[PDB]
Amino acid sequence: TVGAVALDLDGNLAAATSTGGMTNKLPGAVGSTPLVGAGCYANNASVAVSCTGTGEVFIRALAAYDIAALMDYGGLSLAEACERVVMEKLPALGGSGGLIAIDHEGNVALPFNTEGMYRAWGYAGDTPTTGIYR
Amino acid sequence: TVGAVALDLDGNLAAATSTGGMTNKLPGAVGSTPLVGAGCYANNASVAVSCTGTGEVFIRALAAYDIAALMDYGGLSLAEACERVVMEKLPALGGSGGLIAIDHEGNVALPFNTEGMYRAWGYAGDTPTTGIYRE
Amino acid sequence: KAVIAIHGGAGAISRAQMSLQQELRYIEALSAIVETGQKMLEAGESALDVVTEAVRLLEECPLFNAGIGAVFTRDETHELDACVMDGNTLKAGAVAGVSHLRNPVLAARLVMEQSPHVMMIGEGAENFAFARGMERVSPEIFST
Amino acid sequence: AVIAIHGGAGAISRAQMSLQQELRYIEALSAIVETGQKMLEAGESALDVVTEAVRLLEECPLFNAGIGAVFTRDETHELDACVMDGNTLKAGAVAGVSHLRNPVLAARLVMEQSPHVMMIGEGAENFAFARGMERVSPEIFSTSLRYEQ
Ligand SMILES: [Cl-]
Ligand SMILES: [Cl-]
Ligand SMILES: [Cl-]
Ligand code: NA
Ligand code: NA
């Protein structure tokens, strides 16, 4: 699973996610990647999110939209919303993985509950940051 | 599109939705029906919802989960949540249809913004109500 | 207080288009299905089993666009979709783009209960269901 | 203006990997985020930036999307992608596609040229071919690393 989230110079958010799925999966199984609100979501009012990990749990928890709803309705910060979804609610359903998220104010979060998440981010005109491990 | 929502005697909520889809649809097209949070959602903490109407809009607005999040995080009543989604947010994105919803307290709502929605509901040990048109 | 609601679709249903006899066929079908669900709830059946049987009966009813009486694709085929979700466990199951399963909501319950997935699609969903003893049908059975 | 990308979360173990092996991943991530940063700086849309970043992550065989996709139980590839525009709330998605080199480009096509958010399987593929997207053999996705997994 791969993904990207961006905030452009016009203040627009977007998200995209792509995957080959899980090794040895049942043919015809569908995880969170192609499901709006599960593996991918963007809304200028809140956040752009791309998710990777246990597909069935990201769907059941609507992880990507839940970040947006926790911020928009719950008043949580992006950091608080990311902590709640990735470190509390996803493990409570037996889910492991992470997500990348940018809010309309340009805050960035890359939470994950796994050993690693291949990740990078950077502000325009600045030097990128990269990560694999915790 | 057809659907059902129920609250059982144990306090459990459930939802189910089924469809043949948009008439004359492109083969391989997928609407809100099979997408958790779009055409179908249930959570004992909030609400069970089944949706019918413009599939692409119910997906983009995550109509079923939006009812739940508006209640759980927003503190809206089922009636307030149903009004907001079906009468304000869905039409704002060009979406027509409705949904049925039952909350964990046994309130029932059957909002729709169309001319009709084939619908029925009833409390256990009470008489059913049916509807087609508005009012 | 246990309770059920059902629907058979929202849309441009016009009084001027329909006779009272045509309306009563829909009212009769809706009333029979919600009554079955009310009786199951009263007897202490689960919300999950009740929404499954209600949607199975709406599939079986040719008046509604689900299972028997499904609309046609651009290619004059039927492609059916269904979802079920248990508010107790937040488990869910779904199928999309299935043509050889009589009751998609039953295939969705089978994905929920007998697979590690929420959703399966197309021939993969069908093959998974057949392997667990669900019957193969011809999509001709849906045509009215 | 800002971009973030990911190439998957899971049980990545340092005891299993050399620094040279890690740096292949770091180099690929850095090159893609840099391309996105340069697009954002040039005033490209967030939509076009996430599309290109994910297209480059599909192309990169180190990541489980497009080239380098994992195998199904039947030694096939089934790819999925989604794209969403926070301005219009329009989205597009494909699932269960095997003959499209860049699922995120097929998802953009569904968003822009179909009345749907999602299309699946051969129907998604036929939709894309009819609109001039090329058919590939799912052999192009196969790597030794993912097979050995
Ligand atoms: Cl009412
Ligand atoms: Cl009426
Ligand atoms: Cl009469
Ligand atoms: Na039917
Ligand atoms: Na790749």
Numbering used by the authors:
A (entry chain BBB): 179 to 312
B (entry chain DDD): 179 to 313
C (entry chain CCC): 3 to 146
D (entry chain AAA): 4 to 152
Give the published text.
l-Asparaginases hydrolyze l-asparagine to l-aspartic acid and ammonia. The prototypic class 2 enzyme is EcAIII from E. coli. EcAIII belongs to the Ntn-hydrolases, which are expressed as immature polypeptides that dimerize and then autocatalytically cleave themselves into α (∼20 kDa) and β (∼15 kDa) subunits to form the mature (αβ)2 heterotetramer (a dimer of two αβ heterodimers).
The small side chain of Ala at position 207 is neutral; it does not affect the protein structure and does not participate in hydrogen bonds. In both the RDM1-8 and RDM1-24 variants the D210S/S211T substitutions are similar in their chemical character to the natural residues and support the pattern of hydrogen bonds typical of the WT protein. Moreover, the type of substitution, i.e. polar to polar (RDM1-24), polar to non­polar (RDM1-12, RDM1-18 and RDM1-29) or polar to polar/nonpolar (mixed combination; RDM1-3, RDM1-8 and RDM1-38) also did not influence the ability to autocleave. Analysis of T m of the autoprocessing mutants reveled that they can be divided into two groups: those with decreased (RDM1-3, RDM1-8, RDM1-29 and RDM1-37) and increased (RDM1-12, RDM1-18, RDM1-24 and RDM1-38) T m values.
